[PDB]
Structure 1
Amino acid sequence: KSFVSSPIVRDSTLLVPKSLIAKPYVLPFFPLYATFAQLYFEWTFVYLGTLVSLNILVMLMPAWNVKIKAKFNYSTTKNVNEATHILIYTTPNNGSDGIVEIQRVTEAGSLQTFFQFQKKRFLWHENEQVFSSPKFLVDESPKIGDFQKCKGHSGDLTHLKRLYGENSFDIPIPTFMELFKEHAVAPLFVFQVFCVALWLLDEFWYYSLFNLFMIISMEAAAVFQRLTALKEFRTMGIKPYTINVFRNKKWVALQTNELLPMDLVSITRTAEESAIPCDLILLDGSAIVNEAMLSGESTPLLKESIKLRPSEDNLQLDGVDKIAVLHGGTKALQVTPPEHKSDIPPPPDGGALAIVTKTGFETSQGSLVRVMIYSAEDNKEALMFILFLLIFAVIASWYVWVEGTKMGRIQSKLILDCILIITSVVPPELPMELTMAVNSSLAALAKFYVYCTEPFRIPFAGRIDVCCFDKTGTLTGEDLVFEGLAGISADSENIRHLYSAAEAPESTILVIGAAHALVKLEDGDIVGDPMEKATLKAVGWAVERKNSNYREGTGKLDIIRRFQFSSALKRSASIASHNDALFAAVKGAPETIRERLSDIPKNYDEIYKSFTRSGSRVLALASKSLPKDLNRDDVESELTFNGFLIFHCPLKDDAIETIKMLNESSHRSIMITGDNPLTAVHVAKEVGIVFGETLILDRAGKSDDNQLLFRDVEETVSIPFDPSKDTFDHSKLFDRYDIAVTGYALNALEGHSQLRDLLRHTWVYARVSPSQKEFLLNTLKDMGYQTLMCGDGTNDVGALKQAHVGIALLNGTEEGLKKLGEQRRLEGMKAPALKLGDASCAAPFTSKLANVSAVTNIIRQGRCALVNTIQMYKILALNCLISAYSLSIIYMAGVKFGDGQATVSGLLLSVCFLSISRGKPLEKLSKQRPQSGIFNVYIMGSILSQFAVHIATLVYITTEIYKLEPREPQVDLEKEFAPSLLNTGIFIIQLVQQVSTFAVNYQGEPFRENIRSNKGMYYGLLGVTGLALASATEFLPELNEAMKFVPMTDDFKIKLTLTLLLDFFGSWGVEHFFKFFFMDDKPSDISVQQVK
């Protein structure tokens, strides 16, 4: 039969669809139905009931597991020409099993069986009788001649389209039905449908159907909201744009979707909100790409051609020959056309030609995103809560059943009472309360443009212990900006000195403008390295169509001849002229220029090493006077120092304050970047992640043998280390220095005994691969900490997915977003745009703004959400216990309430219970963290003690009332409501208990705003308290008479009032007692900060 051959699959069996008659559940049942019909032609109806139930269950058994579905519905076969479905048994580390449909199509006279599993294509090869995925040429060892000699596609490529597919990134979104099926498993929903069914068993039809409809509508709205969020924010921004392609020996302009491997393209200077299509390789030309999105580094890399290499012997290595590859998802800042002629004509544009190698999801970015999407992977608190409620309901039901069978009532009424207890175990307004809370949290988050697609992760942001960060794009910008000169002095009064702008002497402002490669076109434009343009604008130079540049504010200047920038001996030059005389400007790397000029300054080396060891990328320029077309070694014979040029990506104006606020709030913040260790350490020290001296783990030598070395930022201390013999001496390393581990040191330390002791004491990780951030976050989660990740690139997509709460920062300002919203509103009535990228595809939260304080806002909302959840759970527990006791004990006595009393009390207390959720958090972050879960000594003790206080109060007052009036031993449960004294003596105290169970437990000061600032609940409690205290002391005889209350004596009034006050005060006091003695709100051990 078939045998799929791929590292994703493990086993595979074909499947043929069985008819509607041969299904396993159907054949056996007809004999049972015939037997039941024969026996029928009371007690027998339950048999038909359970038979129908088991039949319907057999039918729904398949849908939960795909293995059971494939076993029941389809029967395995051994002929690939007749099966129409195939089961795929995936490997342990790749997703889950599934069923994929075998498609067929006839092309060129031959049918081509094929399907597609996990966005990875498969095809049918008859020679080996296996479904084999395509293998590209670049993966197989290629001779470089195979790439050099290719001449594009020719003929009819109707087979390549089938074998490789279209270069398209289409991510699937889940349908509404599966998303609803995910929600319809939750314990609350199944409990609600179970209880409404139990009630429908005997109650009315209209009320039950209305309740069921109101339950279904909430889930419908929730799934609609989540599905809209998914549909908007689950995609990578990829828009096809026309490029030239060499097909049929002529340059014809195709789109980006119709690209195949071994196709000649001509890439130009990439415009805004666009990227390189797919994995290309330079065949001729040059470029300057920016790997900030995919690789995650700041400096723009310089790519070169592949033509000069020998053709026959050498092999395409992707080692030494890494300077020619171009990934997909990076921007090309500058491109140069090919120099000499080849066997193909040059492109019609000014671009450079290159070869495609991989397309679609098989490229690097596509592979990362696909492995994130498909290869992906507590509820015990809710389960224990349900079991607790059920235990107490069962106790009460046993008591009421024994008492009923002792009194002599029929079984039907006892069953109805035991059903009513379990039906009333939970308030009816719980779904509306939960929906209101979720919608309020979402609409409060969405005012900072923070859209969330999984609302059940908002409570996760309350107890965050570790906050991870990405450097490039998240904390700093991704472009180099001109900072100012340096080093043009001889006083040695201060090394780090930046002549910010326009403070240079005449020589430096002449040289900065004479030594460049920009040029103005005829139609009006400027081309060149954007950093050169940036410095030429910052100094204030203006280039014209003629190479002469002027209008700087002092005069004019013209260029005679300019030179190129070679990869080796990296530098440039230029020959300019002025009104006075003629000079020659030179601008190149500092070390190469240093050997060139004669007059070596004194602070040259010091300034170079001081500005290069911390992030910045210096450029040392020099000049020389030239008196009145010549060689290159003559103009660069000897020069004169004229100044530096310092470029570095600038911090976000919001990072320092956000990190300080997260540090002063018992959080631990670390940095996981991809840049070199020096820049990472510098930015982490400037922001406030590390404080003291910093050590770095990196390779000791160059070649091999896995020997790490603790080395300072400078050359002061060099502590050697060996991951084979030595071990971390904590007292001498971790106490005196904050260390930062690189990627190679983290790779050579795998399997070490103290790897976790290392990970506990490192705050900065530099030069890590996109596959090691996942390992770091998985280890931090396995240790026991709660994690967070805030990035923007494509390399940190797996880390964003694996964290407990992920955040993806897009680009955009407040003004631009407000203007876009206003324009959209105006268009519906009658600044650069934002790109969705690949980080927003995996992160649940997606801050459409660019600033970093989104992390602080999300944590501030998560604290409030968690507090609301805990308070609601505790109040539900108390109300359940009180209602169970009330029913079980009271109802077995002669206590029945009127209608108006119950109506008013229910209205007011329901208003309060619905107003529980509404509460605005405080603008400050505190060091105390909310409690997680109800089940612990503090909350359980508080609940049980408050229940005990209420029981004691109620027992005392019942004894007092039975002292006033006779006990009436004989009781009947059919007598209607009648004004009595037990009635009022119980009702007033029920009201006061329901007031106390809110007023004592609601108040949370450090996490959200006070109760008085919650006007709804405050006014509700005030109204109910006024009602109770006006009914207790009969302050208003008209109100007491209007509500069917019996007139009381004086001593009983005094006793009742004192009992109410003592009940409330004792409850509050014992709650405060447990809160003071057993709070236990402790920050994590890693969160504490000590002076090293």
Structure 2
Amino acid sequence: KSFVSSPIVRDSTLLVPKSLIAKPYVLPFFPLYATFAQLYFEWTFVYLGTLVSLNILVMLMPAWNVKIKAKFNYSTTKNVNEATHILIYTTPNNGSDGIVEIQRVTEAGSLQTFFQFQKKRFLWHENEQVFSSPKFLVDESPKIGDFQKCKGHSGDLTHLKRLYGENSFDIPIPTFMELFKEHAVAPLFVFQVFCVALWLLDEFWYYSLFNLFMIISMEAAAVFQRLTALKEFRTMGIKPYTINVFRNKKWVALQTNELLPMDLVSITRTAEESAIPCDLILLDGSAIVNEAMLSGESTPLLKESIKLRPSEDNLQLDGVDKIAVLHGGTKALQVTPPEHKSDIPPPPDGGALAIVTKTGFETSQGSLVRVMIYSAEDNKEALMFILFLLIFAVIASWYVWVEGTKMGRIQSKLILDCILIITSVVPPELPMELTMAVNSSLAALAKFYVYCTEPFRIPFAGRIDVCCFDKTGTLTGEDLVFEGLAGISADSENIRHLYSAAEAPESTILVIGAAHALVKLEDGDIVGDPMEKATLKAVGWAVERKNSNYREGTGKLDIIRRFQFSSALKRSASIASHNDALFAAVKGAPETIRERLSDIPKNYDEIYKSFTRSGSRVLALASKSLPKDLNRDDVESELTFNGFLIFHCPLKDDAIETIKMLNESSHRSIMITGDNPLTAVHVAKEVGIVFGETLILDRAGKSDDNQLLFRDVEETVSIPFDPSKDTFDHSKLFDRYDIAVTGYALNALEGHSQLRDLLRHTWVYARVSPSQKEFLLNTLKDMGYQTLMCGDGTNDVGALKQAHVGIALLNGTEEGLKKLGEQRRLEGAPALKLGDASCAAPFTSKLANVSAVTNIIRQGRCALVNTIQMYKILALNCLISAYSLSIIYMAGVKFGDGQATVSGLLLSVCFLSISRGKPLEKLSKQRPQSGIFNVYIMGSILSQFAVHIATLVYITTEIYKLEPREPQVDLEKEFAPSLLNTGIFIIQLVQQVSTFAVNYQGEPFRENIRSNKGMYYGLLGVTGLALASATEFLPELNEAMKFVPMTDDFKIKLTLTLLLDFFGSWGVEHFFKFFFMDDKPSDISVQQVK
């Protein structure tokens, strides 16, 4: 018997399929059918009906639960040589159970059984009799000699291709049937089809068939739209590109999909729209990677080789040995070929050779994406609404049935009346209205290039409480840019004074162009550190083919001999030559240059520490006159200070305004980043997330013991802390200082009693791992708030998936998108990359600016308002119609077709015009309501209904006082012009006007009613028709509308009753909205001065 062995599975039972007659429902039902046939050879037909129903239900019973499907279709066996399926019982926190097909294929005279569950390959090992996932060499504790003594793969590697598979990231998308099955369960669709069945049971067939066709077409179109969106956006951008791989003792060029562990490849300078293939270890050479996408840190690291380490005893640690690993999904800005000769020849390119370690969904990025996809996880308002309407319809049907029994009609007509009531309990224009609303919201979002794949999350963006943010890539760029010199002065009048350019003396502008490592090849190009290129271009230098560069606007320059950048004693050097004299320029970290030059200025330390404590990365450069080969020490004997070079990632010109708009709108915006605390605090303080002084929780000492320390940005205040003894002194910490928790401190405070009281008062989290953003969002969702996440990297994929509404900011300007669209149209500015963050986030702003959050919230407010107003109007109209049927139909009241159609057309015009409205430009501090079931809305609905009923009863009593009552009445008579018909129809029109005019108006969330031309014209027309027919202004139209003339006193009474009805309904609705509105922001949204 099989037994899968992995941390994902819990138990496993083999399965062998059963024949068609072996299925449980089919064999037994034959005795019941034979018994029914014998009894048959009236009341018995319902028995065949229920028997067919139960048979069809047992037929479809498996599809709901997979365990039931395995119980019914397949039978459990304990021999893997014959089982064809296997039931995988997963662990509690890893996806759900499943049925996967056991596959087989013969290789080299021996077949190999295997399957694949959650993209994790399994294989049948006979000696252990288990399905064991592949285990890699770097997973265990490997000897560094085992890595240094590698020479690539050789022979026929057809078993490795089966053990490990291919290096491909292929995400599967759902099909049409599995996507429509989710829409075929909502109560709206079930109620629609049930009502269609009830109606066709007695009414015609052609109209029912057309209606069913329409219902099918609506769902088909919706599912097709959702499927198109999913198929477009649910994928990561991974295009294979040729690389040189050392196989069979020769450098042969394979693709990226054909990489296996322990394969020697040659990585070069990674071009655009590409990244490092998979997890590599640097066997020889050097590089400068950019981990801003996978890790979240802005500075480019400097990786080194592995050859200098002793191969005998040392172990590949991934601790001290983390300066040699290159993850997958990072850009390599520069690569240096090997220096000395090795056993294998150097690569044909200029790249460095490395060793593959993991491939596919086993790497870091692949593992994050896989766990997000597979290991992931109310709709009761509509159900309660249907229950409400059905209760009222039941009371209506009970009354009408009692009255029909007391009058003496047949049972069939009473049944048909009950069915008519239950069918008209909901208007037919509800599903088309919901579809128009969803499509209008989607087409309004798609004007800012914001595409959504879960359209039911747009109403979620109306009551957002906490707005989380990512720093690198979302608020700031991920590339260092120049800022300007510093320290070039002798006045000390100010520290932060940045001479941009064209203001430095000749010495500084010669040193910035003399101490560099860029070179121009013979074909024409420039290779080197990109920040060095940026500064050399901003200063305005032009490099030539020879090492000598000129055309700086001042003169020419030549480089005699240059030095390298060492790992230790980090600095550089160069010996340049000028037409005037000769000097040697030095450029390196300031902490090493300060102890090297003779003349120490008075503001060296002040300027350095002022610019290094806030994000920026300075590079102090110095020079020295050199009179006429030489070593490096005597060149760096004594120098002369010249200035600094300050770089930092610049803010987006849209972040400040967006965060200000969110602050002035009762939103609490926080920051969750992976950068060091200083840069995060600086950017948050510059954008507007924190205002006053800020404290930081980080490790106090160095080694261990989890003892934190509250410390200012500077060295002013230092409050210790112990996660087992001390408790958060709210009075002196939270009221006087903003704070920012790091990742180590947030990890050491696990299990603390006041962790939530802390999380209620921190706005910046720096240096958090990809698995702590999920924890933070889960805690913020358990606290009761509604969260939002807006990021772009791979580390915050789980955070984007866990939030109530997630947004993934791609790259691309507006003009670039317009040009790309124009080119696409003509065929039918770098391109945009889909990345890994767009696979989890439902929304995906194809632009880069941060205003997508504001636009999405502004659309969510409008969508929620529209939903609430539609629910309220439908409830009121349905109650009024139910009463109208129940009571009025029991009297001799009926109208001709002409008046009915003439009024119904305007009613439908207004009802359709309701949905079309434009949201205001300004975000308001008041938030809409969440759901219809509360005190305010329900009270207002019931009170409006009571007022309408009282008015109708008053006019009925008045009319019965005027004209006789006629106790004997019949419901089969045809239409006859009378006074009661007019006196009721006028009030019907007035009530159907008031139910919109009183309940539509929402000022703070969308434009006024007068700006809605359609609905305004409709209501004006209906009220004008009613008021002109009441007082008989045009007798011709009254005689054309089959309205009988009336006396003056009754017309006056009717007009006064109309006015009183309208004004009373409006007044009591305003009363409830004024007394029990309760639109208050949360407690975390208030902003109090400290």
Mark yes or no: TM-score above 0.5. yes
Q: Structure 1 residues 1056-1065 or 296-305, which shifts more?
A: 1056-1065
Distance in 2 between the 1:474 and 1:145 partners?
42
User: Alignment partner of 2:4: what SS?
Assistant: coil
- The separation in 2 between residues aligned to 1:464 and 1:784, in whole angstroms, is 11
Counterpart CA distance in 1 for 2:990 and 2:913 is 18
Q: After superposition, what is the alpha-carbon deviation per residue over 1:428-462, rounded to whole angstroms, capped at 9, x for unaligned? A: 11111111111100000000000000100000000
Post-superposition CA distance 1:942-989 (Å, at most 9, x none): 101100110111001001111111000011111111111111111111
> C-alpha separation between the residues in 2 aligned to 1:102 and 1:908?
64
Deviations 1:525-573 (CA, angstroms, capped at 9, x unpaired): 0111001100000000010001011001110000000001011000000
**What is the DSSP-based 3-state SS (H/G/I as helix, E as strand, rest coil) of the residue aligned with 1:542?**
coil
| Paired residue secondary structure (2:63) | helix
> Cα offset for 1:904?
1.4
1:380 positional shift: 1.5
Aligned equivalents of 1:375, 1:918: Cα separation in 2: 41
SS in 1 for 2:373: helix
CA positional deviation for 1:1066: 0.8
Deviation at 1:211, TM superposition (A): 0.7
Distance (Å, rounded) in 2 between the aligned partners of 1:890 and 1:779: 56
Q: Secondary structure at the match of 1:482?
A: strand
Match of 2:976 in 1: 978
Between the aligned partners of 2:717 and 2:76, the Cα distance in structure 1 is 68
Equivalent in the alignment of 1:631: 631
CA distance in 2, matches of 1:1087, 1:596: 53
1:114-171 CA-partner distances (Å, limit 9, x unpaired): 0100000000000010000000000011000000001000000000000000000000
Task: Kindly provide the CA deviation profile for residues 744-764 of structure 1, in whole angstroms up to 9, marking residues without a partner as x.
Answer: 000000000000000000000
Question: Which region of structure 1 is more displaced relative to structure 2, 632-641 or 903-912?
Answer: 903-912
CA deviation vs aligned residue, 1:589-643 (integer Å, no higher than 9, x gap) = 0000000000000000000000000000000000000000111100000000011
Deviation by residue 1:289-334 (Cα, 9 ceiling, x = unmatched): 0000000000000000000000010000000000000000000000
Distance 1:1078 1:213 in 2: 45
In structure 2, what is the equivalent of residue 794 of structure 1? 794
Percent identity over paired residues: 100
Post-superposition offset of 1:658: 0.3
Secondary structure at the aligned position of 1:419 is classed as helix
Which stretch shifts more, 372-381 or 33-42? Answer: 372-381
**What is the distance in 2 between the residues matched to 1:258 and 1:735?**
59
> What is the distance in 2 between the residues matched to 1:758 and 1:388?
44
Instruction: Output one character per residue of 1:665-717: Cα deviation in whole Å (capped at 9) or x when no partner.
Output: 00000000000000000000000000000000000000000001000000000
Alpha-carbon shift at residue 408 of structure 1 (Å): 1.1
Aligned equivalents of 1:985, 1:929: Cα separation in 2: 42
The 1-side partners of 2:565 and 2:294 are apart by 26
Please list the CA deviations of residues 66-117 of structure 1 after superposition, one character each: whole Å capped at 9, or x if unmatched.
1111110111111111111110000000000011011100000000000100
C-alpha separation in 2, matches of 1:755 and 1:916? 47
CA distance in 2, matches of 1:1047, 1:14: 85
Q: What SS is found at the alignment partner of 1:306? A: coil
SS of residue paired to 1:512:
helix
Give, in angstroms, the shift of residue 907 of structure 1. Answer: 1.3
Q: How far did 1:916 drift?
A: 1.0
Give the Cα–Cα distance (whole angstroms) in 1 for the partners of residues 459 and 1081 of structure 2. 17
- Report how far residue 186 of structure 1 moved: 0.6
Residue 361 of structure 1 corresponds to 361
- 1:311-710 matches, within 5 Å, as 311-710=311-710
Distance, in Å, in 2 between the alignment partners of 1:163 and 1:716 is 59
TM superposition shift of 1:905: 1.5
CA distance in 2, matches of 1:557, 1:287: 29
Deviations 1:320-356 (A, max 9, x none): 0000000000000000000000000000000000000
SS of aligned partner of 2:497? coil
Taking the aligned partners of 2:23 and 2:115, their CA distance within structure 1 comes to 26
How far did 1:914 drift? Answer: 1.3
Q: By how many angstroms is 1:197 displaced?
A: 0.5
298-307 vs 968-977, which deviates more? 968-977
Deviations 1:983-1025 (A, max 9, x none): 1111111111001000100010000111111111111111111
* 1:894-944 deviation digits (Å, cap 9, x = unpaired): 111111111112111111111111000001100000011111111111101
Match of 1:208 in 2: 208
TM-score relative to the length of structure 1: 1.00
Q: Distance in 1 between the 2:762 and 2:734 partners?
A: 9
Q: Which whole-Å deviations, capped at 9, do the CAs of 1:488-529 have from their partners, x for residues lacking one? A: 111110001100112111110010000000000000001110
> What secondary structure sits across from 1:916 in the alignment?
helix
CA drift of 1:890 comes to 1.1
Q: Determine helix, strand or coil for the equivalent of 1:64.
A: coil
- Rounded to whole Å, the distance in 2 between the matches of 1:505 and 1:401 is 101
Q: Which runs of 5+ in 2 are unaligned?
A: none
Name the CA distance, whole Å, in 1 between partners of 2:1052 and 2:908.
30
Q: Distance in 1 between matches of 2:273 and 2:478?
A: 14
Shift of 1:892: 1.1
What do residues 822-843 of structure 1 show as CA deviations (whole Å, max 9, x unaligned)?
Answer: 0000001xx0000000000100
Match of 1:941 among 931, 939, 958: 939
Distance 1:392 1:760 in 2: 45
CA distance in 1, matches of 2:98, 2:1029: 67
- Structure 2 Cα separation of the partners of residues 78 and 700 of structure 1: 58
Deviation string, structure 1 residues 165-192 (Cα, Å, up to 9, x no partner): 0000000101011110001111111000
Q: CA RMSD in A?
A: 0.5
For 2:887 and 2:261, the matched residues in 1 are separated by 80
Structure-1 residue corresponding to 2:869: 871
Distance 1:914 1:367 in 2: 49
Counterpart position of 1:174: 174
Instruction: Report deviation, 1:808.
Output: 0.1
* Unaligned residue ranges in structure 1 (runs of 5+): none
* Number of aligned residues: 1090
- Give the whole-Å Cα distance in 2 for the aligned partners of 1:1061 and 1:523: 89
**What is the SS of the residue equivalent to 1:634?**
coil
Residue 217 of structure 1 is matched in structure 2 by 217
**In 2: Cα distance, 1:758 partner to 1:535 partner:** 43
Structure 2 residue matching 1:338: 3-state secondary structure: coil
Alignment partner of 2:853 out of 852, 855, 877: 855
Give the distance between the partners of 1:16 and 1:382, measured in 2 at CA: 43
Match of 2:1053 among 1052, 1055, 1080: 1055
Are 1:1081 and 2:1079 an aligned pair? yes
| Partners of 1:824 and 1:316 in 2: CA distance | 51
SS of the equivalent of 2:302 reads strand
> How far apart are residue 390 of structure 1 and its match?
1.1
TM-superposed CA distance for 1:360, in Å, is 0.2
Q: Shift of the alpha carbon at 1:384?
A: 1.1
String of CA shifts for 1:708-755, please: whole Å, max 9, x gaps. Answer: 100000000000000001000101100000000000000000000000
Q: Does 1:192 align with 2:192?
A: yes
Compute the displacement of 1:409 (Å).
1.1
Measured in 2, the distance between the counterparts of 1:673 and 1:662 equals: 19
User: CA separation in 2, counterparts of 1:207 and 1:982?
Assistant: 33
Aligned counterparts of 2:598 and 2:157: Cα–Cα separation in 1: 63
Alpha-carbon distance in 2 for matches of 1:945, 1:356: 73
SS at match of 2:921: coil
Distance across 1 between alignment mates of 2:61 and 2:1057: 58
For residues 753-776 of structure 1, what are the alpha-carbon distances to aligned partners after superposition, in whole Å with 9 as ceiling and x for unaligned? 000000000000000000000000
Three-state SS of the structure 2 residue aligned to 1:303 is coil
Partner of 2:894: 896
Q: Secondary structure at the match of 2:1085?
A: coil
Q: Does 1:1091 align with 2:1089?
A: yes
Separation in 1, partners of 2:650, 2:189: 51
